[PDB]
Structure formats: C-alpha cells, structure tokens
Amino acid sequence: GTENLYFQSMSFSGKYQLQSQENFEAFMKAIGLPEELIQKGKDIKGVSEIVQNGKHFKFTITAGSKVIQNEFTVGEECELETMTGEKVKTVVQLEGDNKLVTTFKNIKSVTELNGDIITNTMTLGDIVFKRISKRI
Amino acid sequence: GTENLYFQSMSFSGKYQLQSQENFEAFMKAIGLPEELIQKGKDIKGVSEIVQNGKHFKFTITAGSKVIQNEFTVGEECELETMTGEKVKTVVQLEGDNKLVTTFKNIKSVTELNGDIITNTMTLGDIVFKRISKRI
Numbered sequence: 001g002t003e004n005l006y007f008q009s010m011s012f013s014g015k016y017q018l019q020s021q022e023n024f025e026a027f028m029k030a031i032g033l034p035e036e037l038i039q040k041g042k043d044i045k046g047v048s049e050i051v052q053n054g055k056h057f058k059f060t061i062t063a064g065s066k067v068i069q070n071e072f073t074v075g076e077e078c079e080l081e082t083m084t085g086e087k088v089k090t091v092v093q094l095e096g097d098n099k100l101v102t103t104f105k106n107i108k109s110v111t112e113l114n115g116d117i118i119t120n121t122m123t124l125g126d127i128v129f130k131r132i133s134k135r136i
Numbered sequence: 137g138t139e140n141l142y143f144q145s146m147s148f149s150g151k152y153q154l155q156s157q158e159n160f161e162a163f164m165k166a167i168g169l170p171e172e173l174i175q176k177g178k179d180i181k182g183v184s185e186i187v188q189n190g191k192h193f194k195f196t197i198t199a200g201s202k203v204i205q206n207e208f209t210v211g212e213e214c215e216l217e218t219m220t221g222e223k224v225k226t227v228v229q230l231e232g233d234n235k236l237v238t239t240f241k242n243i244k245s246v247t248e249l250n251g252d253i254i255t256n257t258m259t260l261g262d263i264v265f266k267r268i269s270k271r272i
C-alpha cells in the first residue's frame with residue numbers, strides 16, 4: 001500500500017526587489033568570485049522573480065552583476081547553477097509552509113517568505129550571506 | 137494564495153521485529169548512555185511499531201531497555217525525545233517514497249523501508265548505528 005503526503009505552502013510566486021544585503025563581499029570571496037565582479041555588483045539591488053506551480057519552482061535571481069536562472073521540483077534532485085557558474089546537483093525541500101531549504105558545496109541556503117518580505121540566508125562557515133527583498 | 141505540493145510514499149505503518157543491530161555499544165557510549173544501561177539492553181531485540189496517517193507519524197521504538205514514543209509531521213518542526221531522554225527539536229523529511237531522514241545533535245538518522253524490511257541507520261562521526269527490522 002501507499003500513503004499520500006499532501007502539503008500546502010504560501011505562494012512564492014512574485015517579483016522581489018532587493019533591499020538589504022549582508023556579507024556580500026565576504027561571501028563572494030569565499031566562493032572565489034573575482035574581485036572585479038565583486039566591486040562591480042556589491043551595490044546592485046536588482047529584482048528577482050519566482051514562479052511556483054505546485055512543488056515546481058522557476059528562479060530568476062539578480063545577484064550582483066549576474067542574472068542566474070534555475071528550475072527545480074521540491075524533493076527531487078536538480079542541477080543548479082551557482083554564483084560561480086559551476087553546476088551542482090542537490091535537493092530542495094520545503095519546511096513548514098514558507099521555507100525552502102537546500103545545502104550545496106558547504107553552503108546552507110534557507111529561503112523564508114514572511115508576508116511580502118522574503119529572506120534568503122546562505123551560511124558558509126562564519127559567513128552569513130543574508131538578503132532581504134520585498135515583493136513589489 | 138497557497139500552493140499544493142503532492143507527494144507519495146510507501147506505507148511505513150506496521151510492527152517491526154528487530155533482527156540485526158551493529159555498533160549498539162559504541163553509539164550508546166558516544167551519546168552518553170550509562171554503562172549500566174548499555175550492557176542491560178545491548179542484546180534486546182524487541183518489536184517497534186509505526187503508525188502513519190498521511191504525513192503524520194506515530195512510532196513506538198524499543199531501544200535497549202527503553203521504550204521511547206514520539207510523534208511528528210513530515211516537513212514541520214517537531215520535538216523528539218532522544219535515547220538519553222533529552223528532547224530535541226528537528227524536522228523529518230521524506231526522500232523518495234521510502235526514506236525518512238532527519239538530523240539532530242550531529243546525528244544523521246536515516247530510516248529506509250524496502251518492502252517488509254526496514255533499515256535504521258544513525259551516523260555519529262565514525263560510528264554507524266545500523267538496525268535492521270522486518271515488518272510482522
């Protein structure tokens with residue numbers, strides 16, 4: 001026999017304007033981002049978009065001077081393009097009704113949606129890369 | 137708005153008779169179980185029960201000379217009682233259709249159901265506490 005595990009989450013779909021950003025320079029250096037691109041995009045506060053259809057997600061992230069697009073299904077292994085352009089395979093999971101959690105290359109990524117504010121925290125050792133964006 | 141995330145797993149419900157057990161003493165020593173209780177329950181091969189109703193689990197596990205009962209919902213943070221009686225808060229996740237995975241106090245716990253055979257693997261550093269039970 002089989003069991004049905006049905007979940008319900010807040011809609012992550014929407015366009016989000018980057019407002020706050022912590023430890024950008026430190027984090028990009030740890031992952032090996034060139035200093036040229038670090039200073040070029042450290043002050044860029046762009047707009048990211050999420051498209052959620054059930055457990056499927058489409059991410060369009062404006063990070064610094066780069067636009068990185070990725071797609072995944074919750075609970076299924078996916079190939080994600082990192083900030084450094086390297087492609088890693090990982091699984092994204094839903095915690096509660098508003099947290100998207102994944103871990104790749106010693107980076108613990110947590111994306112929590114609180115109302116119109118979405119917070120993406122990425123921890124690499126002592127570095128806590130925290131981004132705060134608002135739905136527009 | 138809200139989104140629906142539909143998952144399906146094998147039914148974990150049933151009573152399971154412990155058959156094989158490796159590194160009981162080493163694991164219980166690592167978590168600080170008193171040596172009196174370690175020798176007392178190292179050879180006990182009891183029966184554990186799982187009650188799964190969708191994404192909610194009720195499991196009564198016979199570990200050594202202790203009967204520990206806990207309840208949780210997959211993806212939601214819950215409070216679990218450990219072997220040492222300490223209560224920890226963690227999140228249990230479903231991997232595939234037959235794996236229940238969680239991590240607490242540097243202990244990676246994996247419970248995999250392959251047909252009528254259930255395998256409980258708990259890794260704490262170098263110690264791999266492996267329990268193999270059969271549904272009865």
Ligand SMILES: CCCCCc1cc(O)c2c(c1)OC(C)(C)[C@@H]1CCC(C)=C[C@@H]21
Nearest residue numbers: 197199204217218219228236238245247
């Ligand atoms: C259904 C899986 C969710 C996690 C359940 C989970 C939690 C837990 O309290 C225990 C579980 C596994 O299995 C045994 C082998 C009895 C453990 C022995 C040593 C420790 C620290 C605690 C025991």
